[PDB]
């Protein structure tokens, strides 16, 4: 694979980190080259990490913040990207404003968020209501907090609402991109559930489909279409969904030869979606080419399970993917391949 790269990439960078990261997300600020930044974590003292990346038109660690337990997931708040929520290996979800913490570390989170009885990974900030955070847990619950309602000197926040519709481990949660009340969740009970926070019944979802034939592990809403979202599963399938007819699956993307953990739409291209998991492959899909023609690219760079990945928001087709052997890769498939 390493020998074949000039054929398949316009860019590939490999970085062995000192510790594995379970988490990867590009921050939205970019400053011959340009400087981009990634939110990462450690697994096995733990830190919340901000790294720098030079990209054309080196990777340095900029910020390490003491974290209790590994960082299961870390997500920046869209309305103030200095704010980062993290999932811990305990019931706690933590919140850090990276500017209120030392350059190098000495765990003293800015907020500790209560309401779960077990650890999880799923985590999602509302991009339409500032400080509304959702978290999914192995306890079968989804918790909601409004951190914007928390007093200046408040360090502890109880869950505003707990959603209980699921009957198994809740794997992932994600807000809708346009509708401030609407989010989706996926769980081990094989369901996708669409929830409406304006509803008083926190035990029953607005809609509910039996999405998959095994555990549903991830979901992602389309940033270009109000109606479209995708799920990924222990099914080894990515399923496609329309909010106007949830009961029938629009499509199935086959396939990974193993369990799917992440699915994310492109921020630049409405027909483009990527997925990954335990087969150590990150696949890029093209809706438009359905009628496997919809498989546009297989990224074979990783030699361990891929933990998370993120589409760079400033630089089309750039992806950061991180694996369980400590490897972070920043890569862009060849222009020849998408156009």
Swiss-Prot record:
This is Histone-binding protein RBBP4. Core histone-binding subunit that may target chromatin assembly factors, chromatin remodeling factors and histone deacetylases to their histone substrates in a manner that is regulated by nucleosomal DNA. Component of the chromatin assembly factor 1 (CAF-1) complex, which is required for chromatin assembly following DNA replication and DNA repair. Component of the core histone deacetylase (HDAC) complex, which promotes histone deacetylation and consequent transcriptional repression. Changing residue 20 to A: Loss of interaction with ZNF827 and loss of localization to telomeres. Binds directly to helix 1 of the histone fold of histone H4, a region that is not accessible when H4 is in chromatin. Subunit of the chromatin assembly factor 1 (CAF-1) complex, which is composed of RBBP4, CHAF1B and CHAF1A. Subunit of the core histone deacetylase (HDAC) complex, which is composed of HDAC1, HDAC2, RBBP4 and RBBP7. The core HDAC complex associates with SIN3A, ARID4B/SAP180, SAP18, SAP30, SAP130, SUDS3/SAP45 and possibly ARID4A/RBP1 and ING1 to form the SIN3 HDAC complex. Belongs to the WD repeat RBAP46/RBAP48/MSI1 family. It is found in: Nucleus; Chromosome, Telomere. Changing residue 121 to A: Loss of interaction with ZNF827 and loss of localization to telomeres. WD repeats lie at residues 9-69, 70-115, 116-163, 165-210, 211-254, 255-300, 301-333. One of its GO terms (biological process) is brain development. Its main location: nucleus. Expressed in neuroblastoma cells. One of its GO terms (molecular function) is RNA polymerase II cis-regulatory region sequence-specific DNA binding. InterPro entries: G-protein_beta_WD-40_rep, Histone-bd_RBBP4-like_N, WD40/YVTN_repeat-like_dom_sf, WD40_repeat_CS, WD40_repeat_dom_sf, WD40_rpt, WD_repeat_RBAP46/RBAP48/MSI1. Changing residue 70 to A: Loss of interaction with ZNF827 and loss of localization to telomeres. Changing residue 324 to A: Decreased interaction with ZNF827. Keywords: Acetylation, Cell cycle, Chaperone, Chromatin regulator, Chromosome, DNA damage, DNA repair, DNA replication, Isopeptide bond, Nucleus, Phosphoprotein, Repeat, Repressor, Telomere, Transcription, Transcription regulation, Ubl conjugation, WD repeat. There is a cross-link at residue 104 (Glycyl lysine isopeptide (Lys-Gly) (interchain with G-Cter in SUMO2)). Pfam families: CAF1C_H4-bd, WD40.
